[PDB]
Amino acid sequence: SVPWFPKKISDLDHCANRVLGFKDNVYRKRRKYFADLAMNYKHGDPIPKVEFTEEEIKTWGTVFQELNKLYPTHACREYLKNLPLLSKYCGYREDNIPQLEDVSNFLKERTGFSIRPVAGYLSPRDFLSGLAFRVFHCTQYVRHSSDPFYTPEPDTCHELLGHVPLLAEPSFAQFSQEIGLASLGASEEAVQKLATCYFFTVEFGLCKQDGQLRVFGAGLLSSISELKHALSGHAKVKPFDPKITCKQECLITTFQDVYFVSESFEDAKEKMREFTKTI
Numbered sequence: 001s002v003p004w005f006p007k008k009i010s011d012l013d014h015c016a017n018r019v020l021g022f023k024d025n026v027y028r029k030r031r032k033y034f035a036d037l038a039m040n041y042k043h044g045d046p047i048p049k050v051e052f053t054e055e056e057i058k059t060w061g062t063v064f065q066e067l068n069k070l071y072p073t074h075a076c077r078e079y080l081k082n083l084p085l086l087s088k089y090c091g092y093r094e095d096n097i098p099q100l101e102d103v104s105n106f107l108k109e110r111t112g113f114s115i116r117p118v119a120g121y122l123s124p125r126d127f128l129s130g131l132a133f134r135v136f137h138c139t140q141y142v143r144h145s146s147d148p149f150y151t152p153e154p155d156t157c158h159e160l161l162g163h164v165p166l167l168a169e170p171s172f173a174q175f176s177q178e179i180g181l182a183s184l185g186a187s188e189e190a191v192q193k194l195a196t197c198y199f200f201t202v203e204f205g206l207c208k209q210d211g212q213l214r215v216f217g218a219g220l221l222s223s224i225s226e227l228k229h230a231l232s233g234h235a236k237v238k239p240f241d242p243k244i245t246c247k248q249e250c251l252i253t254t255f256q257d258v259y260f261v262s263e264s265f266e267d268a269k270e271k272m273r274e275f276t277k278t279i
C-alpha cells in the first residue's frame with residue numbers, strides 16, 4: 001500500500017517534528033533553544049525571529065566574507081544573480097544574520113517557495129515531501145564558533161548562503177519541487193534514489209555554463225574548502241544521469257568522491273522526469 005504523505009502544505013506539521021562544540025554545554029543549551037523553536041513551529045506561523053549572539057554573527061561574518069570572494073569565479077550564473085537581491089531585501093551583510101522569516105517571505109514572492117524551521121535530520125521521505133509544497137526545511141542555528149569553516153551538520157549559514165539564492169530562481173525551484181512531488185507516496189527504494197539525485201544536484205551539483213564548470217550544490221556554496229576542491233583539478237566529475245547518479249554513495253564526513261554536472265536546471269529536470277517514469 002501507499003505510505004502516508006502530506007496532501008496540503010499544513011500537513012508538513014505531522015512530519016517536520018519527526019527528527020531522527022559537542023562537549024560545549026553552553027552551545028548545547030543554545031542549540032536546543034533552536035530545536036524547541038522548530039519543534040513548536042506550526043504552518044501559518046511567522047517563523048520566530050532570533051536575536052543571534054555577537055559570537056554567532058561573527059561566525060556568519062567570517063563565513064560570509066570568505067565565500068563571497070569565491071562566488072564570482074565558482075558559483076553558477078543564477079546564484080550570482082539572486083545573491084544581490086537577498087542583500088537588498090533580506091539583509092545579507094557581513095554583520096547581520098538574515099532572518100528565516102524575511103527570507104521565506106522573499107522566496108514566496110519570487111518562486112512561491114517558503115521556509116519551515118527543522119530541529120534536525122528528518123527521513124528522506126519527510127524532507128523531500130516538503131519540497132512538493134515548495135517548502136524547504138531549514139536549520140536556524142549557527143555552527144560552533146571554534147570552527148567557522150567546517151561543520152559536521154548543516155547550519156543556517158549553509159541554508160542561507162547555499163540553498164536560498166537558488167530557491168529564488170524559478171527554473172531551480174521547479175526542479176526541486178518535482179523531486180518532492182515524485183517522492184510523495186513513492187516506494188522506499190524510489191525515495192532513496194530521489195534523495196540521492198537531490199544530494200548530487202541540490203546539495204553537490206555542478207553545471208556547465210558557457211563552456212565553464214560552475215557550482216550550484218548548496219553544500220559546496222557554503223563550504224570554503226570543498227567549493228575550491230570541486231572546481232580544481234583534483235575532482236572526479238561525471239555527467240548527471242539519474243540512473244547512475246542514484247547508485248552513488250552520498251558521503252557526509254569527507255569530500256565527495258565525485259561531482260555530477262548538469263547541462264542546465266531545465267535539463268536536469270527533464271532527465272529527472274524520464275527517470276521517475278521508470279521508477
Ligand SMILES: CCn1c(=O)[nH]c(=O)c2c1nc(Cc1cn3c(n1)CCCC3)n2CC1CCC1
Pocket residue numbers: 118119120121122123124125127137138139153154158195196198199203218219252
Ligand atoms: C536528502 C537527505 N536528507 C534527508 O534524508 N533528511 C534530511 O532531513 C535532510 C536531508 N538533507 C538535508 C539538507 C542537507 C544535508 N546536508 C546538507 N544539506 C549539506 C551538507 C551535507 C548534508 N536535510 C535537512 C537538514 C539536515 C539538518 C536538517
Ligand SMILES: [Fe+3]
Pocket residue numbers: 154158162163203218219
Ligand atoms: Fe543542504
